[PDB]
Amino acid sequence: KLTAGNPMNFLGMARSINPAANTIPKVSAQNINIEASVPRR
Amino acid sequence: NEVRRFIPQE
Amino acid sequence: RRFI
Amino acid sequence: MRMFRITACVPSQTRIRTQRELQNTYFTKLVPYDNWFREQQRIMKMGGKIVKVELATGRPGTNAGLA
Amino acid sequence: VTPRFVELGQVSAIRTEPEIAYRSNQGVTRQRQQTKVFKLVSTYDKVAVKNAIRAAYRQVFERDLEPYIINSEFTALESKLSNNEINVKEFIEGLGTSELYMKEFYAPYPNTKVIEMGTKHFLGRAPLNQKEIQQYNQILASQGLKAFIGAMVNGMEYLQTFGEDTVPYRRFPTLPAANFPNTERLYNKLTKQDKELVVPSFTPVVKVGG
Amino acid sequence: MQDAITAVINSADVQGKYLDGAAMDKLKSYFASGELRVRAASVISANAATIVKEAVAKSLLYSDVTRPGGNMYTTRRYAACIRDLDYYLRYATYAMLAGDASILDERVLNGLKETYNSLGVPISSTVQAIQAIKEVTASLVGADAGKEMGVYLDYICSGLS
Amino acid sequence: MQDAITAVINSADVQGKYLDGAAMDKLKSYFASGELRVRAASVISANAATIVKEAVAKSLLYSDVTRPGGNMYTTRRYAACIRDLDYYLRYATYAMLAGDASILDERVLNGLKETYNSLGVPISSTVQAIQAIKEVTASLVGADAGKEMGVYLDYICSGLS
Amino acid sequence: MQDAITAVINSADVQGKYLDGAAMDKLKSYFASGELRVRAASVISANAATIVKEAVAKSLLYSDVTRPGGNMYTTRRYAACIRDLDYYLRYATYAMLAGDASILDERVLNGLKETYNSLGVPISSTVQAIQAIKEVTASLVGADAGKEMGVYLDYICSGLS
Amino acid sequence: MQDAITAVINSADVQGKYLDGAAMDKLKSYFASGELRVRAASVISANAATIVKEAVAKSLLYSDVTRPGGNMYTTRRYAACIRDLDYYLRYATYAMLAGDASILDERVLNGLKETYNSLGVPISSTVQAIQAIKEVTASLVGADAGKEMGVYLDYICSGLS
Amino acid sequence: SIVTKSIVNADAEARYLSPGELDRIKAFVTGGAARLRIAETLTGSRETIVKQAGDRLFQKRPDIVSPGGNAYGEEMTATCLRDMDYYLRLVTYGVVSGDVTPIEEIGLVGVREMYRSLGTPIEAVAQSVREMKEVASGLMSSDDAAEASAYFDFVIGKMS
Amino acid sequence: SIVTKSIVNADAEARYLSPGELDRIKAFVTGGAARLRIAETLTGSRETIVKQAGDRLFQKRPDIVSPGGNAYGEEMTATCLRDMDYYLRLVTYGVVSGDVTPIEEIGLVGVREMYRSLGTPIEAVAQSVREMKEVASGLMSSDDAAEASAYFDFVIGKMS
Amino acid sequence: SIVTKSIVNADAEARYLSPGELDRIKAFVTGGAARLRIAETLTGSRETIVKQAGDRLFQKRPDIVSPGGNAYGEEMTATCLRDMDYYLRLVTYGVVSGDVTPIEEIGLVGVREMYRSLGTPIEAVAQSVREMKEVASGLMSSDDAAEASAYFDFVIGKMS
Amino acid sequence: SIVTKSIVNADAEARYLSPGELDRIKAFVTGGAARLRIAETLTGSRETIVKQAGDRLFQKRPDIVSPGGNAYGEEMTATCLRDMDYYLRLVTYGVVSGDVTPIEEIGLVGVREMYRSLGTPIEAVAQSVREMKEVASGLMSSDDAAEASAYFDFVIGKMS
Ligand SMILES: *[C@H](C)[C@H]1/C(=C/c2[nH]c(/C=C3N=C(/C=C4\NC(=O)C(CC)=C4C)C(C)=C\3CCC(=O)O)c(CCC(=O)O)c2C)NC(=O)[C@@H]1C
Ligand SMILES: *[C@H](C)[C@H]1/C(=C/c2[nH]c(/C=C3N=C(/C=C4\NC(=O)C(CC)=C4C)C(C)=C\3CCC(=O)O)c(CCC(=O)O)c2C)NC(=O)[C@@H]1C
Ligand SMILES: *[C@H](C)[C@H]1/C(=C/c2[nH]c(/C=C3N=C(/C=C4\NC(=O)C(CC)=C4C)C(C)=C\3CCC(=O)O)c(CCC(=O)O)c2C)NC(=O)[C@@H]1C
Ligand SMILES: *[C@H](C)[C@H]1/C(=C/c2[nH]c(/C=C3N=C(/C=C4\NC(=O)C(CC)=C4C)C(C)=C\3CCC(=O)O)c(CCC(=O)O)c2C)NC(=O)[C@@H]1C
Ligand SMILES: *[C@H](C)[C@H]1/C(=C/c2[nH]c(/C=C3N=C(/C=C4\NC(=O)C(CC)=C4C)C(C)=C\3CCC(=O)O)c(CCC(=O)O)c2C)NC(=O)[C@@H]1C
Ligand SMILES: *[C@H](C)[C@H]1/C(=C/c2[nH]c(/C=C3N=C(/C=C4\NC(=O)C(CC)=C4C)C(C)=C\3CCC(=O)O)c(CCC(=O)O)c2C)NC(=O)[C@@H]1C
Ligand SMILES: *[C@H](C)[C@H]1/C(=C/c2[nH]c(/C=C3N=C(/C=C4\NC(=O)C(CC)=C4C)C(C)=C\3CCC(=O)O)c(CCC(=O)O)c2C)NC(=O)[C@@H]1C
Ligand SMILES: *[C@H](C)[C@H]1/C(=C/c2[nH]c(/C=C3N=C(/C=C4\NC(=O)C(CC)=C4C)C(C)=C\3CCC(=O)O)c(CCC(=O)O)c2C)NC(=O)[C@@H]1C
Ligand SMILES: *[C@H](C)[C@H]1/C(=C/c2[nH]c(/C=C3N=C(/C=C4\NC(=O)C(CC)=C4C)C(C)=C\3CCC(=O)O)c(CCC(=O)O)c2C)NC(=O)[C@@H]1C
């Protein structure tokens, strides 16, 4: 059987939560102007 | 993208 | 006080 | 805790050292109050000249609350 | 004929590799030469300052601190050393009087073993004689750990050996008798290798009063 | 060193499990005796010098141990024996408060026999002084507390022979 | 310790010999190998953390070793373990650069088997983790350099058992 | 450390007795020998370097120990060997003055075997050298003082064997 | 400390700028003087003891400084004075190689005036001696190298003043 | 425990426990049943505490369960929830012992080395402890919740 | 630079520079024109190196550019690419100087504490540098790439 | 002893005994009979030295032999005279040895700890030795008394 | 050996060898062949280097080989050449190693004590090495001699 601390014991819990991964983001260093976009507080 | 497993490697 |  | 800030110039007596030695010859350091008497005696025995002593931390005359 | 000066430098008989290996490593360990002495001659080089600090941790605690700390409790002490407000000697004593040192080399062991680990870390050697064991046993019995560390690092021997600017290091004392082999046994053990006293006490030659 | 609470917590962590009913009862037992131990440690600390003084007076004085040739003879060796008894009472008090003798194993008994054998300290006389520490201590902390203190003063004596 | 050069020099000195043809050959061989040693050494240092991470992942994760009751359980023990693996990789790289295992006998293996038996560190698991380090390093440095590291990492493994 | 006088005192102290007539006889015997011991000590100190030089010449030089690979080979080891011989002679002179060997058991022999055996120092060769020191100093200070110094140099040798 | 190379880098770092053409033209200049700097530094290293001997002879010897009452009198002080002159020539060689006097500010002048003032070391005589080292150095490395070495010995002199 | 913390502190000074040290040991043993109740509450509600905390965490840190994230995928999420249960089991050790010694020596000493080697973002582990603290503090009275919170917060402070 | 590093080692032994150490310097100061060539290459193509490496990083670690990630959004993504330009800039300092001391003293001492206080996953920062290394290699000959590779690897090793 | 003292002084400097030390030893052995006579004198009159000095002490310090005094009662009074006998015997050891170390090692190291543990007023012990010094001095010529006085004064100076 | 020194330095700081150190080791192994040739030259002409040096030495220090001198007679003279042979052999060790460490560790630490004990005039031993340096210089090119002389000069300095 599964012993204490075995991550298998939380697989059921993990599936129940079914966390939502962020969508593959739409980012591109090519389109970014570094010197203009960096905050200037 | 890789998906890491929680099983011991054999 | 006795030592005996 | 009370602390002294001490300046001392400790010469070399029985050897001609070749490495740089200024850092251990003329220095200013913080010494805990409970170590100054012993430390002052040691520097004096090594021939050191105590050039400046200051109570960097704490107050003179405290009876309670020395930390 | 073979020149006489050549014969006078010759090795009798052939030597096999075992004899060669044994003869090559005889005598005092090459570790006496193959080492570095961290002497902080300036505070302008922060890389050197940090190197001296990390050597200090390794000397006093016998290894790097990361795997047995949560967060570092020595950051202000490093700040003072780096700012030339204290010296290496004060930094070294600051390590010996720290809660971390108490946890590592005071709480797990009896005061007798605390003494020899103390002299190892801060003086570089096993205790000299029974007078020294007595002297530090009274300090531990009456004032505790911090007093003991303060006694070693502020003594004349420490200043003559390591001075104010040098991290302590392993020594290879010739005198007095048994100091070399006792220091050797201390420094040839890994940390927590065992729970045994190298120098429990010096067997007296003449019992005064008995 | 581990105290009674630590042993319960470690007995469960090594199995990786929360504290169950049986563990709670062991904690409850220790919690019950907390006043008994704290009260005894208070009086012992108040009378530490007196307990050793009267333990020595009743156990070692006016014997061959203190007379010329005895191991307590000479002022240096008298002080050393007094210092050692101060150790044994202070550490037995630690063990009593913690309900566990681990501190005696680690901070007291480890290598003690090696030390005494190299210096020629008589074990049997040392055990008598510790047993006298026990009897003097019991008469001062009451009988219940003196029973618990006796366990840890006996532990030192057992570890010395 | 000794590197490849001083090993030859010291063995010549023990015999009172000038460096003969065979010694000169050994010196030439180390000099020729020198370039590949510095390259592998520079590679390993850039990947030291990632090598140990991969080796642990493939040998000592999600097993009873990291679970409660396993010798890697608790964060302090986990840290001590990967600290130990870092030792072996760094010293194995020293030996690789020196072309001589003596530094391992002197500064790694001395007292190690005793120390692990004292603390209950499982040597079998440790040698597995070292073997995994050997596989991971070989993939990064190459085949020739991988074998050289393999020699010295195997030397540590054989010194543990 | 104990000299001839404190040997008398200690024997009286362990019994808690003042010094009686027999004890005063022992002190007188040592006082009568004082002039012989002092004169011998000054001659030895003024000739210490030459005593060792001749002892080395007739006992160690031109042998396996000085040829390459030997324990006395290399300037450091040769210098260490002379230094050790200086120590033995100087402590024998202490012992001869004190009229008591206890200083040798305490400040010379304590841990000496362990030191030499760990370093590979040849015990027989050092014993032969000390015996050469015994012969040389006897021809300098005379038979009576030579035999007195012989006791304490022979004491060292018996400690090492 | 900073050399000529890192002075250029620092001027760019504090502006967050990659090294531009002008910055490279600075680095080319230093790379062009590298050969002469390394050549002179090798000459001084070979003649270092000789330079101070000659500088001492023409500056200090046979004056009141070396006679009784002078701060060079006694062997300790004479040797200390030469040790200091060894310092100055050697550190000025560092600053010559680096083409930057910063190392003088950090490792020579930092606390030197206070130390000399407390011990009674006369500055004027120390400056006279250093000037002699400069002249002797110039006659040995050439005119342009001696000009650069003079720059960094004059820096110490003005630093002491 | 509070007992070992005091003893070690007094032993380092070669002294008996001070009146204050005995005072807090006495108070600790007197309030023992309240600690065992708080510990009893957390143990019984551990499954809901971790799940609801696990759910709250990933909604604040969706990256860690996104591609490239340390907890990406169900199997790594299960490992992450396991780690939350570890640190929940340790908070209950802290409360019953009255001292954070069981927490430090089991789960915090060297933890930064462990999570650095694994690549787990440590500040996100701390966040999961906040979430468990909130779910926990709503399952008991404020006084009981307040005592439990102090030990949750200790972990959050040390991990952050 | 190389000169300062040699002087520091020599000063730590209270000696003049060894003839070997004076050989490394002499070779360096005559081989320097090639070093300036590598710096010009990296400097001239710094924009494409950073952006191509930045895009490669986001492929491997999309989470850091996702909601909850340290570089999520254009302002944070720009700042991330800004840090890449810093470390590329520091590499040109190392190549020209013939030593890593300029790099370590500007951008690697306390880098763990800075990125810890910001929340940046330093492992990803190590990944970005080795992405710039791969892109830089393509713009340079083998020998030039090997010369610059040590300073890239050094940065990577001190972030890992 | 004078011989041991000079040997340990010489060993501490890793040197042979100096001519000054060797001359002191020569004088001591050649004046040996004179010292032993003083020790014989002290030894033979030890009964009267201790009794008279003890009688004087209790007159000088009646409190120590009153209710609540450390020496109250005949039995405690006997132990006090025993202690005085101990210290007289030590003085004779010092006389014949030409050195105080036999006195120090036997009865002065830790004397403060011993007597504070017993509750004995140590300064009264200094007084008891002082009293023995007068009684002893009055049993010998002035030059002999001066030689013994040095050792009496050493004991007095240490306990006091 | 620079390799041993670098590892010693690196391990004392518990770090991998820096890129600068690895570059020095690289240059060291590349220059090995030239070092080995110089060693072969000295090794090949061993017997003539010693014999001619010894003859030169005795020409300018006749006392040491005349009656009463340390090296008087055939046997003692051969021992003097044997010692010179020792130091020439150590010079080859240093040449190959590229470092004086084999020279110092084997034949210079405590050399003064050894020759003082033997009654050998040390300044004449330094002369003999000077004689071997002059002879050896005339068996190799100017560059090769200059490289070999650093090792001869190291011995000479340590004998003065
Ligand atoms: C020589 C030209 C003059 C002279 C010199 C002199 N100096 C000292 C003592 C010291 N000199 C220094 C200087 C330095 N130490 C360093 O580490 C460096 C930095 C690289 C420098 C410049 C120091 C620190 C001392 C004191 C400590 C020591 O000597 O190690 C003395 C002796 C002073 C005394 O009385 O002990 C002397 C004689 N004296 C002259 O008269 C010359 C003009
Ligand atoms: C931050 C808001 C500003 C800032 C800070 C800054 N400080 C230093 C250097 C030091 N700071 C201290 C202060 C302390 N050390 C201590 O131990 C304590 C007591 C607990 C304090 C308050 C010290 C001693 C130093 C010098 C030594 C060291 O580095 O630790 C620096 C670095 C300066 C340098 O170049 O070395 C900086 C940057 N700087 C800003 O611009 C902020 C406004
Ligand atoms: C008293 C009941 C008996 C006695 C004691 C005695 N002990 C010593 C010397 C030492 N005692 C210790 C003990 C400890 N060190 C520790 O760390 C621990 C753990 C708390 C203990 C118990 C040590 C280390 C020494 C040596 C150092 C020292 O003396 O301070 C002596 C002196 C022996 C000697 O001749 O030096 C004595 C007399 N002796 C008896 O006769 C009693 C039965
Ligand atoms: C969840 C809030 C976060 C997270 C967790 C996470 N952890 C791992 C892997 C491990 N975690 C541990 C932790 C412990 N072991 C102990 O002994 C203790 C105290 C008792 C702790 C806290 C260990 C040892 C591992 C290794 C795996 C194993 O059990 O053998 C992972 C997976 C790592 C991987 O890539 O394999 C994860 C995901 N991750 C997040 O992103 C959250 C912030
Ligand atoms: C990891 C693969 C395995 C493991 C490791 C582990 N080791 C320790 C403790 C120590 N390890 C050493 C080893 C060395 N110290 C050195 O200086 C060197 C030479 C360079 C070596 C090889 C030592 C001395 C210790 C104790 C001291 C210290 O930790 O600093 C532990 C901790 C044990 C404990 O009880 O705390 C662990 C866990 N454990 C495994 O399960 C793996 C198979
Ligand atoms: C020749 C230039 C000078 C000279 C030489 C000389 N030496 C001896 C005797 C010995 N020389 C050594 C030397 C060494 N042993 C080492 O380990 C090293 C380094 C490898 C050295 C250099 C030794 C050990 C001896 C002792 C004899 C032995 O080898 O066993 C002598 C003979 C002295 C005597 O009286 O026996 C001589 C003549 N003498 C000169 O005058 C020259 C200046
Ligand atoms: C000479 C006859 C023989 C010989 C000697 C030799 N000794 C060593 C090293 C050491 N000798 C000692 C001895 C002592 N230390 C003390 O405190 C005392 C008590 C008075 C003694 C006798 C020690 C401790 C050492 C090791 C530490 C040190 O050397 O400083 C060596 C080796 C030296 C080395 O550096 O390797 C040698 C050569 N060797 C022979 O072959 C002779 C028979
Ligand atoms: C004569 C037996 C040897 C000899 C001597 C010699 N000495 C010098 C020059 C100096 N001698 C000293 C010595 C001392 N100054 C001190 O303060 C002390 C302590 C009292 C001593 C011993 C000094 C300082 C000098 C320098 C000159 C000066 O005083 O200003 C010389 C001149 C060397 C030269 O080239 O100028 C000589 C000849 N020379 C021998 O060959 C004999 C072995
Ligand atoms: C008399 C001047 C003072 C005095 C004396 C007194 N002493 C004791 C008890 C003891 N005294 C000693 C002393 C020594 N032991 C040694 O080995 C040495 C040798 C140098 C000495 C001096 C000891 C050991 C004891 C304990 C008893 C025993 O001998 O076993 C007492 C008795 C105290 C009690 O309560 O038992 C007394 C009265 N008291 C005074 O008031 C005088 C100032």
Residue numbers in the entry:
A (entry chain P): 209 to 249
B (entry chain S): 198 to 207
C (entry chain R): 201 to 204
D (entry chain C): 1 to 67
E (entry chain A): 687 to 896
F (entry chain O), G (entry chain K), H (entry chain M), I (entry chain G): 1 to 161
J (entry chain J), K (entry chain F), L (entry chain N), M (entry chain L): 2 to 161
Sentences from the paper on this structure:
Cyanobacteria use large antenna complexes called phycobilisomes (PBSs) for light harvesting.
Within one OCP dimer, the two OCPs connect via their C-terminal domain (CTD), while their N-terminal domains (NTDs) and their embedded CAN molecules bind to AcpA and ApcB of the PBS core. Within the NTD of the OCP, the local resolution of CAN and its surrounding residues has increased to 1.7 to 2 Å, and, therefore, the density for all four methyl moieties branching off the polyene chain and for the two terminal beta-ionone rings can be clearly assigned. The most prominent motion of the dimerized CTDs of OCP appears to be an up and down rocking relative to the core. The flexible linker connecting the NTD and CTD of OCP moves in concert with the CTD dimer. Residues D174-V176 within the linker are in close proximity to the CAN molecule that is embedded in the NTD of OCPR. Proximal to the PBS, R155 in OCP has the largest effect on the TDM, followed by some positively charged residues on ApcA (K61 and K62) and ApcB (K53).
